Design a protein around this nucleic acid. Structure first.
Ligand SMILES: [Mg+2]
Ligand SMILES: [Mg+2]
Ligand SMILES: [Mg+2]
Ligand SMILES: [Mg+2]
Ligand SMILES: [Mg+2]
Ligand SMILES: [Mg+2]
Ligand SMILES: [Mg+2]
Ligand SMILES: [Mg+2]
Ligand SMILES: [Mg+2]
Ligand SMILES: [Mg+2]
Ligand SMILES: [Mg+2]
Ligand SMILES: [Mg+2]
Ligand SMILES: [Mg+2]
Ligand SMILES: [Mg+2]
Ligand SMILES: [Mg+2]
Ligand SMILES: [Mg+2]
Ligand SMILES: [Mg+2]
Ligand SMILES: [Mg+2]
Ligand SMILES: [Mg+2]
Ligand SMILES: [Mg+2]
Ligand SMILES: [Mg+2]
Ligand SMILES: [Mg+2]
Ligand SMILES: [Mg+2]
Ligand SMILES: [Mg+2]
Ligand SMILES: [Mg+2]
Ligand SMILES: [Zn+2]
Lengths: 99, 127, 118, 60, 81, 25, 155
RNA sequence: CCGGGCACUCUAACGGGACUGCCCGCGAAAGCGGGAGGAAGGAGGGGACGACGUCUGGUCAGCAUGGCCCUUACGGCCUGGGCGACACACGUGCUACAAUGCCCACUACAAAGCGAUGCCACCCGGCAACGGGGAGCUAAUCGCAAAAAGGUGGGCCCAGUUCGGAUUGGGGUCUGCAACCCGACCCCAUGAAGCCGGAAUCGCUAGUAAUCGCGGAUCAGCCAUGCCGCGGUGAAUACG
């Protein structure tokens, strides 16, 4: 009934930060339904490639914001604690809400 | 109790359900000729039926989404060609020569910087 | 028949033939058509002089058309000129009066081109 | 741009209509991205060294 | 077009509203060409700036809804060669 | 056509709404 | 087409008369990409070939097409002197396209206000032989008659 | 919508998957034709990618920077003006000159993006722009959203027109300290040039060209028909 919202830029660190939590939940607690990949929201910047003027010849980059959702159904105070201080993320951001 | 097939054309995709009957066709909660009324390429989707000899053998209930009316129709045609290839897949024998077993790789080519339409290029000036 | 000075519309269709009057078209037509309870879809060739005079009476009385309309837009601009006003100057020289770059084609307002040497 | 110009960009009050964006690495008033606060040459310059987080060049 | 509005600048608005109730009237130089004109402006002689200098503009009752820079044009022309 | 602001087709092009393209669905 | 033989674009057969000729003709009636309008026009045309004429409208088409098919044409060629006009025969493929092309363009020059009636009448007059698009096929052949002197320069 | 399931569509990470590896033909080989594969071939279609170098190419106004140069100004602040000028000339465009078309009513089918300093459903006032109210959403969860063409149905009857909407008059809405110069938009009136464009000249080889809408960046607002992208329907033709 309490779910976790995963975001980030590199999906190398984003995926690997869901999978530790899956077994810091499954083994470590009650039932938790597997990682669901919410769609990636893509900011794009297209820009003139040189300093002055060549209006053709752009280069574009993009900032990929990936989402990942894992639902946890029932509280086990080892899940709460393991998922509190055993945090090992890097550029990932996590969220939790009771509702 | 039924047979199934999958096809897609240009971001449009089709779910095909085949459960034998009069030949009645249902599309997304609609009669076939109602949804597609007035579109003259419609009957080309069930073209693999006509060549499989099954006329009023099968009814059809079909869900479809994405793309547009006239490219969805090609997505159904592959659906029916992958569903008919389920009931006695000796119907592979003459389906693929007719070309009803291949998916269209053809899609919108993108846009290029410096161009206008991704090939169409701006008028040359010279002066 | 004839409305607003002379201005005879004929044949065609009645809501259309109403456009052919100075000061009127589209809206001001399809309005006075039901306001006089007349079918717009009919043809001005035939109709009761009844629905004809009800129709001239409305229009010619309601708003100003033709002569007095043109006379008003005249003196309105005369007012913008000779008050020394900006827009007045743009009328005085016959140049474009709102926004409108004049380095290139103003042509509708400017007249046809009068070319000169480089 | 000039100095007092890169400055005045920051002095934002008096009629906030006058607040205009400016590059934090240039002073450049033109082609500044709200998101980065960088302008378009700098975006291209920092993105190319890896110093723009999770910003990769696109191809498709 | 404003309407809940009719923007006039307060700077000359003062000196004009005065020249009614002071009783006396004369020549007043303002930079404000954004402002609208009248009622108590009419008959006053206001010098408006074009970017270069201050142009005398006499005021009357059909100048009413017209901004003060209508009557001070910004560009010098006289045609071509 | 796409430049008659007094038509459906025109409005759509300019991107706007009005008596000739009232917003209802 | 420097290296290749430029193999031919091939079309899906028709959804009524079941014929490639018809589709390849339909396409030529199609302005700015609308196929729906293209067929709805053509199909109304053979409706006109029915109530008007007791004949079978498909058969008219193959006939009207075969009459407006040019047998020979004059192609430009450059030589040990100036540019010339050399008579040759239209390849089967080429005859196709021209007949379909001329048919439509002739059709649109017909004064009839409605599109289908245009192609209708033309295709009738075409089959019966007196068509404006036939005047062309004929005419083209007439050029290659008069130039038969230069017909030794063919390739 | 509920239970229920996630099988499917899909969402997104990881692999798989065709390498001329296989069949006859040719050939000395590399390869090439041809066959059957298979969703796909002969580098599958498209990106990203651009050798030593050339143009004493472009940029001292993105920035950096040697040198020269101004030092109550060649620096600095502001109010206003100009960059928007108009006898004219050229480049890129948009809307058209209509009946495979215009208008009105109804009826459908996309993708990619954006938004809780915002996107605003839904209700009311308004012809309308818009204004009141006001629920949801840190957003596959609410909103932009109507996609348009198309479809059906009726209207127009070849007319400088129900074509085309430039110009101008009057009336208003909004952002903003402020819309005279210079804003965008709505309504009413006005309805111009234009009946496929001299010499000349451009783009495109397929899901391309034509044609139809949609989103974003910048951004208070906007002169965007621009630019970067997304899908809808969808030709013709390559002898050589
Ligand atoms: Mg997809
Ligand atoms: Mg496209
Ligand atoms: Mg360009
Ligand atoms: Mg150039
Ligand atoms: Mg303007
Ligand atoms: Mg100007
Ligand atoms: Mg500096
Ligand atoms: Mg600003
Ligand atoms: Mg800026
Ligand atoms: Mg019109
Ligand atoms: Mg070999
Ligand atoms: Mg390479
Ligand atoms: Mg230097
Ligand atoms: Mg410098
Ligand atoms: Mg200075
Ligand atoms: Mg200043
Ligand atoms: Mg400029
Ligand atoms: Mg030039
Ligand atoms: Mg343009
Ligand atoms: Mg004329
Ligand atoms: Mg202005
Ligand atoms: Mg005409
Ligand atoms: Mg032209
Ligand atoms: Mg090519
Ligand atoms: Mg747009
Ligand atoms: Zn910068």
């Amino acid at each position: 009934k309490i779910r976790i919202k995963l975001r980030g830029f590199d999906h190398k660190t984003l995926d690997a930060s869901a999978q530790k939590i899956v077994e810091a939940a499954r083994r470590s607690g009650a039932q938790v339904s597997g990682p669901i990949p919410l769609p990636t929201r893509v900011r794009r910047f297209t820009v003139i490639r040189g300093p002055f003027k060549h209006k053709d010849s752009r280069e574009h980059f993009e900032l990929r914001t990936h989402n990942r959702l894992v639902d946890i159904i029932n509280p086990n105070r080892k899940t709460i604690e393991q998922l509190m201080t055993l945090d090992l993320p890097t550029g990932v951001e996590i969220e939790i809400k009771t509702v | 109790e039924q047979y199934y097939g999958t096809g897609r054309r240009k971001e449009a995709v089709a779910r095909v359900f085949l459960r034998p009957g009069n030949g009645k066709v249902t599309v997304n909660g609609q009669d076939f000729n109602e949804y597609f009324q007035g579109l003259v390429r419609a009957v080309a989707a069930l073209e693999p039926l006509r060549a499989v000899d099954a006329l009023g053998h099968f009814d059809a209930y079909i869900t479809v989404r994405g793309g547009g009316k006239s490219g969805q129709i090609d997505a159904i045609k592959l659906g029916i060609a992958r569903a008919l290839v389920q009931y006695n897949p000796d119907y592979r024998a003459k389906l693929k020569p007719l070309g009803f077993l291949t998916r269209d790789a053809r899609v919108v080519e993108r846009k290029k910087y410096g161009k206008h339409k991704a090939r169409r290029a701006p008028q040359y000036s010279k002066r | 028949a004839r409305i607003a000075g002379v201005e005879i519309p004929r044949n065609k269709r009645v809501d259309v033939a109403l456009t052919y009057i100075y000061g009127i078209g589209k809206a001001r037509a399809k309005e006075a058509l039901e306001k006089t309870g007349i079918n717009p879809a009919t043809r001005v060739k035939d109709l009761t002089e009844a629905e004809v005079v009800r129709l001239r009476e409305y229009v010619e009385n309601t708003w100003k058309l033709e002569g007095e309309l043109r006379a008003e837009v005249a003196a309105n601009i005369k007012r913008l000129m000779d008050i020394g006003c900006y827009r007045g100057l743009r009328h005085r020289r016959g140049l474009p009066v709102r926004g409108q770059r004049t380095r290139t084609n103003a042509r509708t307002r400017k007249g046809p081109r009068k070319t000169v040497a480089a | 741009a000039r100095k007092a110009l890169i400055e005045k960009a920051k002095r934002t009050p008096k009629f906030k209509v006058r607040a205009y964006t400016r590059c934090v690495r240039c002073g450049r008033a033109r082609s500044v991205y709200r998101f980065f606060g960088l302008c378009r040459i700098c975006l291209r310059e920092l993105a190319h060294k890896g110093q723009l987080p999770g910003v990769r060049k696109a191809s498709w | 077009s404003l309407k809940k509005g009719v923007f006039v600048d307060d700077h000359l608005l003062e000196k004009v509203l005065e020249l009614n109730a002071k009783g006396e009237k004369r020549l007043i130089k303002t930079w404000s060409r954004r402002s609208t004109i009248v009622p108590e402006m009419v008959g006053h002689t206001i010098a408006v700036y074009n970017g270069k200098q201050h142009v005398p503009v006499y005021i009357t009752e059909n100048m009413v809804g017209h901004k003060l820079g209508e009557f001070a044009p910004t560009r010098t022309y006289r045609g071509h060669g | 056509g796409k430049g008659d602001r007094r038509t459906r087709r025109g409005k759509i092009w300019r991107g706007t709404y009005g008596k000739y393209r009232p917003r209802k669905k | 087409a420097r290296r290749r033989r430029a193999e031919v674009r091939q079309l899906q057969p028709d959804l009524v008369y079941g014929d490639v000729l018809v589709t390849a003709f339909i396409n030529k009636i199609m302005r700015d990409g609308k196929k729906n309008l293209a067929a709805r026009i053509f199909y109304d045309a053979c409706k006109i070939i029915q109530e008007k004429t007791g004949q079978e409208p498909l058969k008219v088409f193959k006939q009207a097409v075969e009459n407006v098919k040019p047998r020979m044409e004059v192609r430009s060629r450059r030589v040990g002197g100036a540019n010339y006009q050399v008579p040759m025969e239209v390849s089967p493929r080429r005859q196709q396209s021209l007949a379909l092309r001329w048919l439509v363009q002739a059709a649109n020059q017909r004064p009839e206000r409605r599109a289908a009636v245009r192609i209708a009448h033309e295709l009738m007059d075409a089959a019966e032989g007196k068509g404006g698009a036939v005047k062309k096929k004929e005419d083209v052949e007439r050029m290659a008659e008069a130039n038969r002197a230069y017909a030794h320069y063919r390739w």
